[PDB]
């Protein structure tokens, strides 16, 4: 806590169910390393019975900001 970790993020890929909608996050990755970090989470479910997916900062367009 000091910058911004997981406090409000849209999705922008167009495949991902809650795509353009902004729900909440969690333990976003630490290290330099990989390509699929970030958990996100929101109320609304989706086509599977369980939906709580991990997208990745190449993107999260949050966008402003």
């Amino acid at each position: 806590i000091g910058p911004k970790r997981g406090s409000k993020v849209k999705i922008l890929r167009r495949e991902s169910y809650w795509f353009k909608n902004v729900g909440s996050v969690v333990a976003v990755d630490q290290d330099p390393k990989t390509r699929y970090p970030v958990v996100v989470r929101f109320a609304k479910v989706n086509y599977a019975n369980i939906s709580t997916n991990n997208y990745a900062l190449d993107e999260v367009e949050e966008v402003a900001a």
Binding site: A43, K44, V45, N49, I50, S51
Partner: protein
């Protein structure tokens, strides 16, 4: 379920989302489970993995048929009575063409109510009381 099982509440389960297999109706909202709930409402692969009860339900929720067949028939004996035509028809069979039901002349209704025998307006019958 899980709720209070115990021993430790007469306090009935009115309030707390769900019941019916176990990542159940989930917190997370949906509609499918509202046709679920009515469908398969009676079933047995859930309620408990253990006979026991089920025959203890089916011998009860049976019952409410007889009772029903019984609230039914009443409104048919009453009906086949004071909404008469049975008195009228019997001194006068070969002749009559029986009724038990009749409208009330609200809106369009009445056309449905058309001279049936011992001198009155109503809708006929093909359900052979008046004959038991």
């Amino acid at each position: 379920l899980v709720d209070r099982d115990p021993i430790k509440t007469s306090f009935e389960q009115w309030a707390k989302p769900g019941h019916f297999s176990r990542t159940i109706a989930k917190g997370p909202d949906t509609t499918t489970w509202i046709w679920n709930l009515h469908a398969d409402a009676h079933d047995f692969d859930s309620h408990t993995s253990d006979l026991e009860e089920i025959s203890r339900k089916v011998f009860s929720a049976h019952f409410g048929q007889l009772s029903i067949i019984f609230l039914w028939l009443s409104g048919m004996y009453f009906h086949g009575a004071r909404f008469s035509n049975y008195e009228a028809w019997l001194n006068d069979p070969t002749h009559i063409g029986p009724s038990a039901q009749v409208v009330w002349p609200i809106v369009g209704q009445e056309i449905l109510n058309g001279d049936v025998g011992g001198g009155f307006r109503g809708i006929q019958i093909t359900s052979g009381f008046f004959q038991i």
